[PDB]
Amino acid sequence: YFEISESSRTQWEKPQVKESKRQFIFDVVNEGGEKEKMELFVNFCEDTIFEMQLAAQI
Amino acid sequence: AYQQKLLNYFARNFYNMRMLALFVAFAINFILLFYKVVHYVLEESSGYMEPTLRILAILHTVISFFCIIGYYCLKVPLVIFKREKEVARKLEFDGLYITEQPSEDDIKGQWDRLVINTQSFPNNYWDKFVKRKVMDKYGEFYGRDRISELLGSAVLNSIDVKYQMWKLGVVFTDNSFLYLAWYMTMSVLGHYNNFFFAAHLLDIAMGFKTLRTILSSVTHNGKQLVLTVGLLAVVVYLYTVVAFNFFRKFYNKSEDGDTPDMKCDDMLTCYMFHMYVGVRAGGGIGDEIEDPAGDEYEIYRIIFDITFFFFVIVILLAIIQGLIIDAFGELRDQQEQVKEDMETKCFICGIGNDYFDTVPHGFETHTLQEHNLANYLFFLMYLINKDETEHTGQESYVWKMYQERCWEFFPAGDCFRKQYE
Amino acid sequence: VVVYLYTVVAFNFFRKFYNKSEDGDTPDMKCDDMLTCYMFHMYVGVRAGGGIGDEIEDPAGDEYEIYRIIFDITFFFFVIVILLAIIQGLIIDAFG
Numbered sequence: 001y002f003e004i005s006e007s008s009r010t011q012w013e014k015p016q017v018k019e020s021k022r023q024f025i026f027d028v029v030n031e032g033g034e035k036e037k038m039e040l041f042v043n044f045c046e047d048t049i050f051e052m053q054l055a056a057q058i
Numbered sequence: 059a060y061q062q063k064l065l066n067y068f069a070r071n072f073y074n075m076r077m078l079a080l081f082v083a084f085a086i087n088f089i090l091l092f093y094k095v096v097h098y099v100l101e102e103s104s105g106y107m108e109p110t111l112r113i114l115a116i117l118h119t120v121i122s123f124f125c126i127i128g129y130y131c132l133k134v135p136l137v138i139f140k141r142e143k144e145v146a147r148k149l150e151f152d153g154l155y156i157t158e159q160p161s162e163d164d165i166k167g168q169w170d171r172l173v174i175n176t177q178s179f180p181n182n183y184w185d186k187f188v189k190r191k192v193m194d195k196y197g198e199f200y201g202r203d204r205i206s207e208l209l210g211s212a213v214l215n216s217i218d219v220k221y222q223m224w225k226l227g228v229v230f231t232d233n234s235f236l237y238l239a240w241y242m243t244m245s246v247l248g249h250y251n252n253f254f255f256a257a258h259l260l261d262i263a264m265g266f267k268t269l270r271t272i273l274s275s276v277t278h279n280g281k282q283l284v285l286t287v288g289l290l291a292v293v294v295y296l297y298t299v300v301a302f303n304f305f306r307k308f309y310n311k312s313e314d315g316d317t318p319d320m321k322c323d324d325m326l327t328c329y330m331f332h333m334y335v336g337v338r339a340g341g342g343i344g345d346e347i348e349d350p351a352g353d354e355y356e357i358y359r360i361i362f363d364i365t366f367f368f369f370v371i372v373i374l375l376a377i378i379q380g381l382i383i384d385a386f387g388e389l390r391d392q393q394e395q396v397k398e399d400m401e402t403k404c405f406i407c408g409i410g411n412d413y414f415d416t417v418p419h420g421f422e423t424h425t426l427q428e429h430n431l432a433n434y435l436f437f438l439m440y441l442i443n444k445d446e447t448e449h450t451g452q453e454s455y456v457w458k459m460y461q462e463r464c465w466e467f468f469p470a471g472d473c474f475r476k477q478y479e
Numbered sequence: 480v481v482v483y484l485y486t487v488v489a490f491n492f493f494r495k496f497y498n499k500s501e502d503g504d505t506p507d508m509k510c511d512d513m514l515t516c517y518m519f520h521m522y523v524g525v526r527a528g529g530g531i532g533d534e535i536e537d538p539a540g541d542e543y544e545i546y547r548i549i550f551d552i553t554f555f556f557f558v559i560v561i562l563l564a565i566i567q568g569l570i571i572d573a574f575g
């Protein structure tokens with residue numbers, strides 16, 4: 001149990017990054033082994049932080 | 059600041075904007091149908107249309123330019139990230155520019171040699187110790203001063219110009235920016251002319267999901283398609299060899315000897331006749347050819363007449379059509395299979411569909427209130443802002459696991475209630 | 480769309496081939512103005528079966544003849560063989 005923030009809550013609902021979820025969703029439910037799928041998920045999670053930092057500069 | 063505030067207006071309003079640049083590109087090509095022949099515009103609805111097509115072709119071109127400004131601010135820092143990350147991971151873990159020295163293959167992997175030298179090489183990577191770690195790691199096998207040689211108004215000659223040339227390099231390799239540059243000049247080259255301006259209907263196809271469905275369907279179904287088109291060129295040619303050696307006097311385009319009669323039996327003008335006429339006929343070859351009346355080749359004429367038909371038109375043309383009817387069939391089946399191989403099983407716990415429908419309405423609760431991949435993203439953000447001293451038992455066992463790149467801690471296939479009750 | 484993109488090709492680059500005259504007896508009618516190329520194509524060239532090469536003149540010895548057959552074939556199997564069949568392939572399944 002932890003604490004999702006306030007500003008980090010609205011910025012994931014922003015259509016800026018709501019596109020980048022939809023491109024990542026489309027590329028792992030297709031071909032890709034599950035032994036590296038969570039490997040790919042974290043590599044999505046590292047850059048999705050970086051879109052939050054841009055959308056704060058808005 | 060107003061220069062910065064208006065630039066931040068563009069990256070904000072980007073997907074709003076290119077949706078409009080399609081709607082203008084209809085309005086030209088709804089108006090560009092009003093020609094008459096020098097080329098000039100008529101009028102039926104409004105008295106003035108020469109003003110509209112003048113102002114819209116200016117209004118289209120700047121909106122084509124407000125995307126490529128907006129895309130350079132918005133998605134370029136993303137693509138400057140994922141490039142810069144994969145260099146600094148591979149230079150730290152295996153050290154390809156220290157040990158592997160990558161070959162002629164993957165030139166863009168060898169393009170990143172003008173950036174390791176520079177100052178701002180971790181520009182946007184949140185990790186400014188990629189230079190100091192590798193000097194700490196590989197100073198025992200290699201010289202540290204070799205490594206430091208390998209690594210390292212008033213502002214116009216006080217900025218890292220060698221970084222920007224690498225920064226310009228990683229931009230032009232990106233496909234989505236390249237498409238916007240081409241979509242810009244085809245607005246500008248459609249300002250000289252106006253009929254080499256209707257190549258802005260390509261935006262109908264090149265969306266995003268409908269782009270990667272086609273590139274998947276081509277690699278899955280192209281090699282069969284070409285080699286069945288390539289089969290059609292052979293069996294037509296083998297019929298051309300038959301007719302030119304053995305049947306050549308039947309081809310005429312004359313009004314019974316009035317014109318000095320034209321032939322189609324030389325070497326190629328039999329073949330280019332067959333694949334242009336005899337394919338599209340529907341009656342095979344027996345529609346643009348004379349009749350076998352009482353000739354001594356008449357029995358061999360009908361055999362050539364029938365077995366041209368049902369070997370090329372009934373069979374070989376239909377299984378060409380039978381592929382593309384199925385090759386567009388995957389252009390709807392693939393985008394639907396994503397939307398339904400996502401709702402069967404969960405992403406990370408990987409459990410499935412029935413196991414949280416046994417309780418009343420549980421699969422949304424098991425997903426959106428227990429596993430909910432966004433919550434995992436909010437967790438990894440939570441360890442970043444929280445101080446290192448303050449981590450609890452879980453939040454430091456995870457954080458040391460995430461540093462050492464392991465990922466055993468994900469609930470692989472045994473989520474919470476499947477062991478409890 | 481792909482009919483219209485062929486109309487743009489024929490009207491800018493191939494426009495003198497359209498005739499409905501009895502070899503100059505009638506004061507020959509054209510189909511290359513702005514729209515009467517396009518409304519000709521979608522009314523005739525779709526329903527032909529021979530593509531466009533049935534209600535058009537013949538490429539005899541012209542210097543556009545090699546580019547004539549390319550426009551003759553790739554009108555056919557991009558509109559009639561493929562694009563018309565997958566229209567029919569939907570409704571055959573939509574009644575299915």
Ligand SMILES: Nc1ncnc2c1ncn2[C@@H]1O[C@H](COP(=O)(O)OP(=O)(O)OP(=O)(O)O)[C@@H](O)[C@H]1O
Pocket residue numbers: 018022400401403404405406425429430431432
């Ligand atoms: N581990 C998971 N985390 C989140 N969603 C999941 C997971 N596994 C499956 N899903 C499914 O993904 C769906 C995503 O929600 P939904 O697609 O309805 O809205 P959306 O994501 O805003 O739409 P879009 O996918 O177009 O962005 C959910 O309905 C959920 O059933």
Ligand SMILES: Cn1c(=O)c2c(ncn2C)n(C)c1=O
Pocket residue numbers: 046049184185442
């Ligand atoms: C500083 N820092 C990190 O150190 C980090 C991170 N993501 C993972 N790590 C490890 N992010 C987003 C970050 O900003």
Ligand SMILES: [Ca+2]
Pocket residue numbers: 447448449
């Ligand atoms: Ca503590």
Ligand SMILES: [Zn+2]
Pocket residue numbers: 404405406407408409424425429430
């Ligand atoms: Zn789950």
